[PDB]
Write a protein that binds this ligand. Structure first.
Ligand SMILES: N[C@@H](CCSC[C@H]1O[C@H](O)[C@H](O)[C@@H]1O)C(=O)O
Ligand SMILES: N[C@@H](CCSC[C@H]1O[C@H](O)[C@H](O)[C@@H]1O)C(=O)O
Ligand SMILES: Nc1ncnc2[nH]cnc12
Ligand SMILES: Nc1ncnc2[nH]cnc12
Lengths: 230, 230
């Protein structure tokens, strides 16, 4: 009966989702994005890839909420690990997200902070609960943690160190925080799932190209298991 | 007959606009923002401050377009100068905007570039034309240039140098590019006006606090002159 929004950042991240669902999808173009609207097990699903970055992801999320009236938003994509304990292909659900590249330190504000806002953005307790459930049921080692989002692809131990110490982040990506933020402002529950594609180091660009498709499918697979339970 | 959207980033940047227009404004709250909708000389004007940054400004702009159906968007605020030729209180209208903090260099892309997008975002030719007009008519030395937007308040000659060389930017701020980008995706003409409040150097934070109100009013004043001609 509900309307569920499903997002990815790149076409590659959403292709497996359209497949996995296997239904017929009507394509609606809006604001530079193409939304795939279809029916599935009595639930209306709207799928799309936002394109990379904060601006792109904010726009798409806002459009999905205001134009389609989605009641829940699930995000699927890949991310880079910042901890030894998070490996390639590992799955992770963000508990809190931060915009690691926000800097108003000149006004003596802590990094990541914007007036009239907060440093960390929370995600859905019920969706994250539902993720842990399905994770146990299928023997998947689902991890939890803070995700840092910024408009830079991280590829240096230096930046990695900063993210872990400053924000205690477990993974880094480029759209999580912006998607969760928009959903919070509209009172829409949000879930951010990510699969590790690299280790955000000097070799990050290499590993990313190698595992993009695999990681993308693992994440997409899990996200579908979640929708089957909603 | 038209619907015009007017944006500022901070409450301080929009207070003079509400005053200058002097009409009665109905307050509509949406997505964490408060939109001031009112009638003026037969034109419906929707005013609001987005809050600081790319995510904030993208969300507000998208909401103004999708929920209120604005047909034109005028932005007013302050900015930091990168050139000797641009002084405190000087007025500037952006011809092109760039997101100076986007970095996908790890994939051998030029800075500021995001796949499926472009480095520079163009603004309205007709609105910028109308700005130059009114600028001559009232003896205002209106300048033109490229504006760089990022989620960092710039306060170092070092970053300043980088912005001028990499992007040939004349001024730096935190919302211009995101507002213009959203308007472009929806085919809405956009105009970005800024008044200099500082020189983006080590003393930028000091100068900003000193001139915020003045600069904000100069910009607001001009923006109103523009609406009187629409
Ligand atoms: N190699 C691509 C750029 C991917 S940036 C990494 C993306 O993957 C993850 O979803 C991040 O959040 C970003 O959206 C290209 O060169 O187009
Ligand atoms: N001193 C304020 C922060 C202003 S950041 C500079 C803003 O002014 C200009 O409009 C920029 O684009 C930003 O929105 C504070 O500490 O809250
Ligand atoms: N190392 C990294 N930095 C930023 N976004 C990413 N997405 C996947 N890996 C990433
Ligand atoms: N120096 C600066 N950096 C970023 N945004 C600004 N807005 C006004 N001055 C600024």
């Amino acid at each position: 009966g509900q309307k569920i929004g499903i997002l990815g950042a790149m076409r590659e991240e959403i292709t497996p989702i359209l497949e996995l669902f296997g239904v017929d999808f009507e394509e609606i173009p809006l604001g530079g994005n193409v939304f795939h609207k279809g029916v599935y097990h009595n639930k209306e699903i709207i799928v799309a890839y936002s394109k990379i970055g904060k601006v792109h992801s904010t726009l798409t999320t806002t459009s999905m909420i205001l134009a389609f009236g989605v009641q829940k938003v699930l995000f699927s994509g890949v991310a880079g690990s910042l901890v030894k304990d998070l490996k390639i292909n590992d799955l992770l659900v963000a508990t809190q997200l931060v915009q690691h590249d926000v800097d108003l330190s000149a006004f003596d504000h802590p990094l990541g902070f914007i007036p009239e806002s907060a440093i960390f953005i929370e995600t859905s307790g019920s969706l994250n609960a539902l993720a842990k459930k399905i994770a146990n049921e299928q023997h998947i080692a689902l991890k939890e943690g803070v995700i840092a989002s910024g408009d830079q692809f991280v590829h240096s131990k230096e930046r990695k160190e900063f993210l872990v110490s400053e924000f205690k982040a477990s993974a880094v990506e480029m759209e999580g925080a912006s998607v969760a933020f928009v959903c919070q402002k509209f009172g829409v529950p949000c879930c951010v799932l990510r699969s590790i594609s690299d280790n955000a180091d000097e070799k990050a660009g290499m590993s990313f190209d190698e595992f993009l498709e695999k990681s993308a499918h693992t994440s997409a697979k899990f996200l579908k298991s979640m929708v089957d339970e909603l």
